[PDB]
Short mmCIF file of C-alpha atoms in Angstrom, two decimals:
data_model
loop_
_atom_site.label_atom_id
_atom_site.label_comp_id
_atom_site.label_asym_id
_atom_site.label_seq_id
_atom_site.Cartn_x
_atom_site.Cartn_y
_atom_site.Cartn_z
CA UNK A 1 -41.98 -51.86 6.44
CA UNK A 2 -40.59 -54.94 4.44
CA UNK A 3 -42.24 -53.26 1.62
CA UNK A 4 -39.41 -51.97 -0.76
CA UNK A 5 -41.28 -48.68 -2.74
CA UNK A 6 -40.44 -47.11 -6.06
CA UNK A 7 -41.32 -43.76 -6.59
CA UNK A 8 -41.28 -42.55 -10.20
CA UNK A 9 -41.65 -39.01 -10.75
CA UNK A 10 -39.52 -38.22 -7.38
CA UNK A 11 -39.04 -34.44 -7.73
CA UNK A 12 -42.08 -33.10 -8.54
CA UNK A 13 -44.55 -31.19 -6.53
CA UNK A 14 -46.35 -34.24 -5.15
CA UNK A 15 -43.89 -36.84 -5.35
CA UNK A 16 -40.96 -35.23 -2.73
CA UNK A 17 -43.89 -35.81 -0.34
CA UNK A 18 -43.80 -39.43 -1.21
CA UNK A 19 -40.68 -40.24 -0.88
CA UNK A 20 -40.19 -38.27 2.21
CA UNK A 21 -43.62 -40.33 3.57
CA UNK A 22 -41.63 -43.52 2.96
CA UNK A 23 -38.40 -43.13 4.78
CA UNK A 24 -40.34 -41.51 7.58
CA UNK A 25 -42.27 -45.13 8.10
CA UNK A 26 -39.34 -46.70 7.47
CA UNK A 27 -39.75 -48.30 3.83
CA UNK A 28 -36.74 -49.37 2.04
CA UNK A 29 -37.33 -46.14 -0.75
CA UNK A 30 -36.40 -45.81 -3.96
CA UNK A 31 -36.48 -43.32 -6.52
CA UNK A 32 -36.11 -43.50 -10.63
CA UNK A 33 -34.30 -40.74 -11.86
CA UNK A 34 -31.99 -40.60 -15.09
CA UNK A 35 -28.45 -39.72 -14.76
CA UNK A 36 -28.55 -37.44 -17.76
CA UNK A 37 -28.81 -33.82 -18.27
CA UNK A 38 -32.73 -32.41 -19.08
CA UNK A 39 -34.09 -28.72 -18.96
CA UNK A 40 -35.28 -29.92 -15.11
CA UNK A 41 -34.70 -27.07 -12.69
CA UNK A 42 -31.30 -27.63 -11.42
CA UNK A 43 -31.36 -26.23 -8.15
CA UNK A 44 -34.58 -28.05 -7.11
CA UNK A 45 -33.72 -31.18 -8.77
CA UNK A 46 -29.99 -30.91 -6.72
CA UNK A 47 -31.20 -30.25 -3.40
CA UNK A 48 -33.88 -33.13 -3.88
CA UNK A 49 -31.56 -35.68 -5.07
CA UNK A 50 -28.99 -34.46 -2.29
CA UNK A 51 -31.74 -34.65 0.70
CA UNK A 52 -33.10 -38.11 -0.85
CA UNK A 53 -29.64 -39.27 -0.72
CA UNK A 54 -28.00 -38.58 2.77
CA UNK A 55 -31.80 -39.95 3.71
CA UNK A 56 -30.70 -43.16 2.09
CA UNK A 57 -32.91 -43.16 -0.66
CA UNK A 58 -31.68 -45.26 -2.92
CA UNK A 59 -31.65 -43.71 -6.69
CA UNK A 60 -32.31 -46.34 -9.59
CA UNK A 61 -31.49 -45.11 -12.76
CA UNK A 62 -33.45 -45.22 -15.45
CA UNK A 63 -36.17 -43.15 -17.85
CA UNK A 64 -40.04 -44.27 -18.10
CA UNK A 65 -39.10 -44.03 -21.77
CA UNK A 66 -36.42 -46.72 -21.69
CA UNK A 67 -38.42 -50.03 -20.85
CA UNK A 68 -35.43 -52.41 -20.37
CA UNK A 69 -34.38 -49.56 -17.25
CA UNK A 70 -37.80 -49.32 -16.52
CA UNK A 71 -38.12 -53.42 -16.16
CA UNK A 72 -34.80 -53.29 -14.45
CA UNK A 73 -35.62 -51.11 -11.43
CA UNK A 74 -39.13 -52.70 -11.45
CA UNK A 75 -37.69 -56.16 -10.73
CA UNK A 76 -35.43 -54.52 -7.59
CA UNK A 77 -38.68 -53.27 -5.87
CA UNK A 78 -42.53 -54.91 -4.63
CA UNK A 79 -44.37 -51.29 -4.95
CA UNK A 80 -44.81 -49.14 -7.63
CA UNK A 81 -45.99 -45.51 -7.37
CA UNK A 82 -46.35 -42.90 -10.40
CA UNK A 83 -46.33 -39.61 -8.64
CA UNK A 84 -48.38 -37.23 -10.56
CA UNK A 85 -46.09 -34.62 -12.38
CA UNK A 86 -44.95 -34.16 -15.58
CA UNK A 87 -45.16 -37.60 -16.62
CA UNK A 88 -47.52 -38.09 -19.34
CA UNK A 89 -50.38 -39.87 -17.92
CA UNK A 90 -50.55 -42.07 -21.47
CA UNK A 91 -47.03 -42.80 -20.73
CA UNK A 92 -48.08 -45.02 -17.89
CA UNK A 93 -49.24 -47.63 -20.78
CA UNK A 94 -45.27 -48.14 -20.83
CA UNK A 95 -45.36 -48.36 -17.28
CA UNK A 96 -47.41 -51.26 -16.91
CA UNK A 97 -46.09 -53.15 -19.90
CA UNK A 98 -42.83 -52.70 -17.76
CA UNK A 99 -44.57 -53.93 -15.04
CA UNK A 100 -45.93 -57.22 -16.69
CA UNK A 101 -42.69 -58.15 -17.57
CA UNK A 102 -41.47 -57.92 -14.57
CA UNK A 103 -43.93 -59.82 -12.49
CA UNK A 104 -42.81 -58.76 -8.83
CA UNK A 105 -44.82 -56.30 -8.56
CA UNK A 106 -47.95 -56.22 -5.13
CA UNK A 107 -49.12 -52.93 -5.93
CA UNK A 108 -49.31 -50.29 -8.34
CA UNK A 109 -50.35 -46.52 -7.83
CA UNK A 110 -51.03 -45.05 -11.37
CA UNK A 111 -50.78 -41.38 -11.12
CA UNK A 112 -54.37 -40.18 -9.57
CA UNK A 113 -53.96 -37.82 -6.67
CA UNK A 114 -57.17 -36.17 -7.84
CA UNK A 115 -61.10 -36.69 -7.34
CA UNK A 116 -61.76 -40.28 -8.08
CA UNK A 117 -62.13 -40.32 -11.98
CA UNK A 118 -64.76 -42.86 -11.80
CA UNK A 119 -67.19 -40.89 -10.21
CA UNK A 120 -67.34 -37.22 -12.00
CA UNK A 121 -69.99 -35.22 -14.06
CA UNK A 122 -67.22 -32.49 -15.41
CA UNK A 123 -67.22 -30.68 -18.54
CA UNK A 124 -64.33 -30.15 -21.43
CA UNK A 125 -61.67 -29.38 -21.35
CA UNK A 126 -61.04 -31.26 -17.68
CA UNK A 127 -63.48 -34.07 -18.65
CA UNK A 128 -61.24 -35.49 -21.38
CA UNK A 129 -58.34 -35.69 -18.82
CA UNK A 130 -60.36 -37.36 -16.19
CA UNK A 131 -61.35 -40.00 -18.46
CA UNK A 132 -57.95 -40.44 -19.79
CA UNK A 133 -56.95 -41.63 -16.09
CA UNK A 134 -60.20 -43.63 -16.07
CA UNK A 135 -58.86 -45.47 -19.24
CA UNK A 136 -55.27 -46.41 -17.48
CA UNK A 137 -57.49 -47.67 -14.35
CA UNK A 138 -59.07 -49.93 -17.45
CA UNK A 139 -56.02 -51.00 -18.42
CA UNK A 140 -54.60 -51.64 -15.00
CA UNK A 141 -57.60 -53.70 -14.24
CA UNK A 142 -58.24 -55.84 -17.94
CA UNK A 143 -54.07 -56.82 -17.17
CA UNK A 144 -54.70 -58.00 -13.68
CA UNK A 145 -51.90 -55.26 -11.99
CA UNK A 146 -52.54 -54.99 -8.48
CA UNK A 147 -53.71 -51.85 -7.73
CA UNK A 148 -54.82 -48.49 -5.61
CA UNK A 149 -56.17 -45.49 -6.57
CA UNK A 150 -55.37 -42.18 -3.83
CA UNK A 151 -57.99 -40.01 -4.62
CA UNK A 152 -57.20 -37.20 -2.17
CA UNK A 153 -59.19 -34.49 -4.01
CA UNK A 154 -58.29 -30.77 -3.38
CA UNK A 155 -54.43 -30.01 -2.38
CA UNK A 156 -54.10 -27.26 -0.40
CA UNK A 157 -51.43 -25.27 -2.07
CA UNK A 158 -53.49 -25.88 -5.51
CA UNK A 159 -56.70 -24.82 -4.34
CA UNK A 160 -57.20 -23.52 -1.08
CA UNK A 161 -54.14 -21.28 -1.61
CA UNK A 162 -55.92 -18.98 -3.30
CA UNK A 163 -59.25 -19.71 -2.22
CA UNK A 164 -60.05 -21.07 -5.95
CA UNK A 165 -59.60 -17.76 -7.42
CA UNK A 166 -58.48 -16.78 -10.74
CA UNK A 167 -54.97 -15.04 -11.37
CA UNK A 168 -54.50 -15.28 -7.89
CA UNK A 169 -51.56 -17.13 -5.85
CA UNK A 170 -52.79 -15.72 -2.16
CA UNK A 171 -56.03 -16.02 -0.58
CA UNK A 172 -57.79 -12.44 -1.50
CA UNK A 173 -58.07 -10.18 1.37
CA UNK A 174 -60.59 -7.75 0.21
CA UNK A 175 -63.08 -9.60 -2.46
CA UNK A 176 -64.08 -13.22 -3.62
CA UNK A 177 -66.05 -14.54 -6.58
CA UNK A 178 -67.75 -17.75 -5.46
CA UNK A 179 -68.95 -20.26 -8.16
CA UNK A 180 -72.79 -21.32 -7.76
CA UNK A 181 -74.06 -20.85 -4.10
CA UNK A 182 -71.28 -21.65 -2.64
CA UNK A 183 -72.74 -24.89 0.12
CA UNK A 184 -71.15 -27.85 -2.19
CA UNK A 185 -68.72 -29.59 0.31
CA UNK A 186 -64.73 -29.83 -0.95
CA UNK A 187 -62.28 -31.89 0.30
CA UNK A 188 -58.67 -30.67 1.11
CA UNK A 189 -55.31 -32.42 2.21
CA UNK A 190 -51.81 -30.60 1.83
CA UNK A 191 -49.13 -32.13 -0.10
CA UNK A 192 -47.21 -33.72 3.05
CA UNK A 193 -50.42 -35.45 4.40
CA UNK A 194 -51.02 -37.00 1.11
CA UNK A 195 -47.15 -38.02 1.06
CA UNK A 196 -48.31 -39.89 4.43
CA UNK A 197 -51.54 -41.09 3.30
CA UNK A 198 -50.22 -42.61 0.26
CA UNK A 199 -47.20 -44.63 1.94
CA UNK A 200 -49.86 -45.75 4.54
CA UNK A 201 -52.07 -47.34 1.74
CA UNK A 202 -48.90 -49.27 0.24
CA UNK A 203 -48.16 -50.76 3.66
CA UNK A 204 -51.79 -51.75 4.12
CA UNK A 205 -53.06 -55.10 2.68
CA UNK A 206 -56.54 -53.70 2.71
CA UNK A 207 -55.73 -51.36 -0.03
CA UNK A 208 -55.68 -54.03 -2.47
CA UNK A 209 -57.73 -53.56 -5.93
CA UNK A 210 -59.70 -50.72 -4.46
CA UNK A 211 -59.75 -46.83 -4.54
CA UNK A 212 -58.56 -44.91 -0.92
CA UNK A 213 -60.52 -41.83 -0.25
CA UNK A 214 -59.63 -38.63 1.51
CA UNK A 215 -62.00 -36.53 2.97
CA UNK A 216 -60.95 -35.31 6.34
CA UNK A 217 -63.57 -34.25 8.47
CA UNK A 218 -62.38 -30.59 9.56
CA UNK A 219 -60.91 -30.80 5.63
CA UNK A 220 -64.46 -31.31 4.15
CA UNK A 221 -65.47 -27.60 4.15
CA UNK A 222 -67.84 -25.75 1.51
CA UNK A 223 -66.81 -22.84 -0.34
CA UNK A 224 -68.72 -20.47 2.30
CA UNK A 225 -67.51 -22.44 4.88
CA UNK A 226 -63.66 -22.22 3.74
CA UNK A 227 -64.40 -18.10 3.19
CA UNK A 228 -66.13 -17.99 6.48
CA UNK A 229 -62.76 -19.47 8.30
CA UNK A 230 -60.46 -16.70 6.50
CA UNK A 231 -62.73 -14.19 7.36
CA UNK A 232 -61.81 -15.02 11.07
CA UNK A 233 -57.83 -15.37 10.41
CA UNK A 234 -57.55 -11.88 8.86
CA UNK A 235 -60.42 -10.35 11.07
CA UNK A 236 -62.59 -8.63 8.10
CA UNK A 237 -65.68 -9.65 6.24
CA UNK A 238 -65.03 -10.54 2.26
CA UNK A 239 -66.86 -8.82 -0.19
CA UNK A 240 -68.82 -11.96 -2.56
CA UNK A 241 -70.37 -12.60 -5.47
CA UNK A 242 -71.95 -15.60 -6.37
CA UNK A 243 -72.37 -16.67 -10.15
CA UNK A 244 -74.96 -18.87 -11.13
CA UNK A 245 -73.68 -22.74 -12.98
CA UNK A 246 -74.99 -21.44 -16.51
CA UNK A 247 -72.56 -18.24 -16.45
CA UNK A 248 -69.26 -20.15 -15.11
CA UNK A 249 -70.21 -23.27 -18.16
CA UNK A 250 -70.70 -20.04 -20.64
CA UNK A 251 -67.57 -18.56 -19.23
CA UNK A 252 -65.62 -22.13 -19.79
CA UNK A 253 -66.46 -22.45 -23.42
CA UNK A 254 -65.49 -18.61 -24.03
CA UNK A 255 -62.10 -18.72 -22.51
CA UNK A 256 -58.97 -19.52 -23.94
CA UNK A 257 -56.49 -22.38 -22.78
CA UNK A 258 -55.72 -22.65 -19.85
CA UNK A 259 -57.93 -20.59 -18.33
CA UNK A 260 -61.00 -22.59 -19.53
CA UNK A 261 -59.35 -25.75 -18.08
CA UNK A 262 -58.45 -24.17 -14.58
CA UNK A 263 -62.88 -22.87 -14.30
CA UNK A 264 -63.92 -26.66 -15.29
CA UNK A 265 -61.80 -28.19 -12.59
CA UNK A 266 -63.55 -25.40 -10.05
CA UNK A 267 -66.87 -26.39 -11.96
CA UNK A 268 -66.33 -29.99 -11.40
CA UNK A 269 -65.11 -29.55 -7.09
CA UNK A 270 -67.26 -26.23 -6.62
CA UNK A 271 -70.39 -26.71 -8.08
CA UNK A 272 -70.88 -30.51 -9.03
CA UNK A 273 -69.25 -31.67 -5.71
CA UNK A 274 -66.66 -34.24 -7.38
CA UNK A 275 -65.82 -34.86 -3.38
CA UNK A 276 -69.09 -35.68 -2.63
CA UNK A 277 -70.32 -39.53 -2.13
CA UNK A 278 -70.84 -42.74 -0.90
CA UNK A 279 -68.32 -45.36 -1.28
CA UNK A 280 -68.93 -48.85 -1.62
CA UNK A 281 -66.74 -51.30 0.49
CA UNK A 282 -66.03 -53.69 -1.89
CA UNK A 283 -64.03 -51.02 -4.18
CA UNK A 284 -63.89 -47.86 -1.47
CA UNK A 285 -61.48 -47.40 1.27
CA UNK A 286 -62.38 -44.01 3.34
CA UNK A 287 -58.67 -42.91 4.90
CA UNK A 288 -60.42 -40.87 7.71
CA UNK A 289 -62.20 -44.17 8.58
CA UNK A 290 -58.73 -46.94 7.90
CA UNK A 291 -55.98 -44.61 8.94
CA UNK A 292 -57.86 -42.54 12.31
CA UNK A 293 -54.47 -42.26 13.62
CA UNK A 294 -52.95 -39.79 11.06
CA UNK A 295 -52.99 -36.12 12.41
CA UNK A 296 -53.93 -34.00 9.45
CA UNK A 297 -53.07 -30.35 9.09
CA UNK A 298 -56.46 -28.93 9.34
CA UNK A 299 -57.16 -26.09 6.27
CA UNK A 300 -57.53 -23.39 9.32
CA UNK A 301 -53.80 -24.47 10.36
CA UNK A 302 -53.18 -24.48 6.52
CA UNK A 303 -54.06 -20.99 6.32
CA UNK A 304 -52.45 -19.55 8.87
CA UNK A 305 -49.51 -19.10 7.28
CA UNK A 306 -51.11 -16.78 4.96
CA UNK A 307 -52.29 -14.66 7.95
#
């Protein structure tokens, strides 16, 4: 817990998680935020800052746009995590120039939170963003940053939410479309649990220059599998369709932005299985295997709430 941990991109979605991880183990926590006025949501940004605060999170201030504040909260702290948000993920070229010029820093976590970007066969328009994270994991590498990579795959309140349906925000109580046949494994994790994962990786010395994996076992369903369970909650069968890989890639190039984006990430975790593989030790670090002790809302306790 001697580890003192940055989080940039504090508010967002995936990042409250984070920071909320950190003081729970105990890590001296710090957060970047600028002390300026942006179109940010003001009540969310507010209560976050407020909460974060009486926590003790200590706020650095400073913009990922402004190296010399960027070097200058860098320099206060040993760990470095971009939470994924709205930062640009370019943007984290500035982030690691910061970061050289610092020199203090034991660990860096660009902003991945995804499937592992090394190890995808996806199609535009998701393909192009995938490798643009691949390219910062060059760049991390070729300057010698120490790094980790959280691949958690599928969060729960992005996909299983709606049981990777379109225009939908609810799982669908009456009918599903389900994209090939529906027996590729996913892998899920809600928000919080990757908040805990993540912090547990910085405190770990094992984590060092290599990617951490999660794919909890009663987590790793398939898409019949994850219909199958709702079926039980809400006591009633689903109607289905199934649609064969040519029509969803057909459907992809003939939709407009971002629709076409949203079917290639479902392509990419429905039908290629992006959560499916082996990992090799030398890079690979499988959470379910390093961190047995984390209790993990399961996706039937996830959906419960839906019930």
């Amino acid at each position: 817990t001697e580890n003192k941990i940055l989080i940039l991109g504090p508010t967002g979605a995936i990042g409250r998680h984070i920071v909320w991880a950190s003081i729970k183990a105990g890590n001296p926590t710090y957060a970047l935020v600028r002390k300026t006025i942006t179109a940010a949501n003001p009540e969310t940004k507010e209560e976050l800052i407020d909460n974060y605060q009486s926590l003790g999170v200590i706020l650095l201030e400073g913009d990922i746009n402004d190296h010399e504040t960027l070097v200058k909260a860098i320099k206060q702290v040993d760990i470095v995590i971009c939470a994924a948000g709205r930062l640009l993920i370019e943007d984290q070229v500035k982030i690691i120039k910061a970061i050289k010029e610092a020199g203090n820093v034991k660990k860096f976590f660009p902003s991945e939170f995804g499937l592992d970007v090394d190890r995808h066969d996806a199609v535009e328009p998701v393909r192009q963003v995938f490798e643009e994270k691949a390219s910062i994991r060059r760049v991390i590498e070729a300057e010698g940053v120490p790094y980790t990579y959280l691949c958690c795959h599928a969060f729960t309140g992005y996909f299983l939410r709606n049981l990777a349906q379109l225009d939908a925000t609810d799982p669908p109580r009456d009918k599903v479309v389900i994209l090939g046949d529906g027996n590729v494994k996913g892998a899920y994790v809600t928000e919080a649990d990757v908040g805990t994962f993540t912090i547990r990786a910085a405190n770990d010395p094992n984590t060092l220059n290599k990617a951490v994996h999660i794919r909890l076992p009663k987590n790793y369903l398939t898409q019949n599998e994850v219909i199958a369970l709702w079926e039980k909650k809400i006591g009633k069968t689903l109607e289905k369709t199934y649609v064969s890989e040519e029509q969803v890639l057909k459907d992809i190039q003939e939709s407009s932005f971002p629709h076409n984006y949203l079917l290639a990430l479902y392509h990419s975790q429905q039908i290629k299985g992006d959560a499916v593989y082996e990992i090799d030790p030398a890079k690979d670090i499988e959470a379910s295997e390093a961190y047995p002790d984390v209790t993990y809302t399961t996706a039937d306790e996830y959906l419960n709430q839906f019930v």
